[PDB]
Design a protein around this ligand. Structure first.
Ligand SMILES: N[C@@H](Cc1c[nH]c2ccccc12)C(=O)O
Length: 437
């Protein structure tokens, strides 16, 4: 397939924020931003909007929507997504300077997991935001920080789209304000109780690590884009994203890559262990259990002896905390898609806690609400076959007047109740605080 047409645009370090600001209020407008980060994997920023097809999954049903046709289906949501992908009959050859050339882009929420495993339904469902919300885009705006170039690509009419881009305006305000203090869904004693429940479950053998999180919430008013813009500057997280959905918006400040699939080369970098702003025997041990997880997760689809562990226990300094990351690599077989892979490993072992299903069972049992978008993934499935995805840690959900932000902490035998309590706070204190002003 006839590669897309490309127009290079004027260069500017902030082009991503610059062009996106006139799209930010549009439903299905999405920005993947590398957080202006100093990082090996912070080369690109990508913008899309105006999809030619969208997919929305709520539970058991997926709605596939185009121009002139709307269908519903109970089939597997990633199978369905891949079928939509193949019928667009668009398949450009792979290009290291354009990792997305149109294709699927969006949100894969934590509860989407429910379509891949049978799970209990204890946690309350109190957020109405889809389990899968992704657009099919025949164009993209790509900002390359390595090469310094801004490329506008279209499989359609790339003059038409520059034209359309041009004309979009950056929209009269409305100031973001938090209208309540942050409030947790747990007291210290309720956290306390479920931390011990976790440990009795670890002591009685079901699991060996379980990620337990608390959720903070508040009322707010105003537009979320400016707030994103000040959170992004302060977090400089390499896998950040701003998603304007039909239901509300997602402000991700994630520094964590889930799965990269680049020209069939697989990379996943789970984050596990932190201290506030790396010999830490308990953490560089909590991480290894997650590394083994991933090993197993990607190796269910990977090329036979392709899984390697090129990197263990590296610390990366971030605004809020010091974190520990490991890296696992592998090769996708030429007969499968990045989407089969996503499906085999979703949701991320680093935010569930091995073994994954039993770990997800406890989470549903102890967390008072479903996680919805938090700890699910955001990313793209390009028409060229590449894939990149994050773990939506450090991520808020802004919907119907309310904004949410969760915080988790991995629990193992060696974990201590008050210190783990504090870690959940450590991870998001700069984010709750900045929003308060
Ligand atoms: N950091 C990625 C692009 C990116 C930014 N935010 C993201 C969120 C999800 C997936 C990818 C991204 C890169 O350089 O290629």
């Amino acid at each position: 397939t006839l590669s897309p047409a490309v127009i290079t645009l004027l260069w500017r370090q902030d082009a991503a924020e610059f062009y996106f600001s006139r799209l930010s209020h549009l439903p299905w407008a999405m920005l993947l931003h590398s957080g202006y980060a100093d990082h090996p994997y912070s080369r690109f920023d990508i913008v899309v909007a105006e999809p030619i097809c969208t997919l929305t999954t709520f539970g058991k049903e997926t709605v596939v929507s185009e121009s002139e046709k709307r269908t519903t289906t109970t089939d597997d949501p990633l199978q369905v997504l891949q079928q939509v992908l193949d019928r667009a009959d668009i398949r450009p050859t792979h290009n290291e300077d354009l990792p997305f050339q149109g294709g699927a882009l969006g949100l894969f929420g934590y509860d989407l997991g429910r379509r891949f495993e049978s799970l209990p339904e204890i946690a309350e469902q109190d957020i109405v935001l889809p389990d899968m919300a992704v657009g099919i885009y025949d164009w993209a705006l790509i900002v390359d920080h390595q090469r310094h170039t801004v490329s506008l690509l279209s499989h359609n009419d790339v003059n038409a789209r520059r034209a359309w881009l041009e004309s979009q305006q950056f929209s009269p305000q409305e100031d973001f304000t938090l209208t309540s203090d942050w409030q947790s869904n747990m007291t210290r004693e309720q956290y306390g109780e479920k931390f011990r429940q976790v440990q009795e479950y670890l002591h009685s053998g079901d699991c060996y690590q379980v990620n337990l999180a608390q959720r903070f919430h508040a009322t707010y008013s105003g537009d979320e884009w400016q707030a994103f813009l000040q959170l992004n500057q302060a977090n400089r997280a390499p896998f950040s994203a701003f998603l304007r959905l039909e239901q509300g918006a997602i402000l991700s400040l994630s520094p964590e890559r889930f799965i990269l699939c680049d020209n069939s080369e697989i990379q996943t970098r789970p984050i596990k262990g932190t201290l506030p702003r790396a010999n830490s025997a308990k953490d560089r041990a909590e991480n290894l259990m997650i590394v083994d997880l991933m090993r197993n997760d990607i190796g269910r689809v990977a090329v036979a002896g392709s899984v390697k562990v090129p990197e263990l226990f590296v610390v990366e300094p971030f605004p809020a905390v010091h974190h520990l990351v490991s890296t696992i690599t592998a090769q996708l077989p030429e007969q499968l898609h990045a989407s089969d892979l996503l499906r085999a490993a979703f949701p991320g072992g680093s935010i569930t806690g091995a073994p994954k299903v039993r770990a997800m069972e406890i989470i549903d049992e102890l967390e008072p609400q479903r996680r919805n978008a938090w700890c699910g993934s955001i990313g793209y499935l390009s028409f060229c076959g590449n894939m990149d995805t994050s773990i939506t840690i450090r991520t808020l959900t802004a919907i119907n007047g309310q904004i949410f932000c969760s915080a988790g902490g991995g629990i193992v035998a060696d974990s201590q109740e008050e210190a783990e309590y504090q870690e959940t706070f450590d991870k998001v204190n700069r984010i709750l605080k900045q929003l308060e002003k």
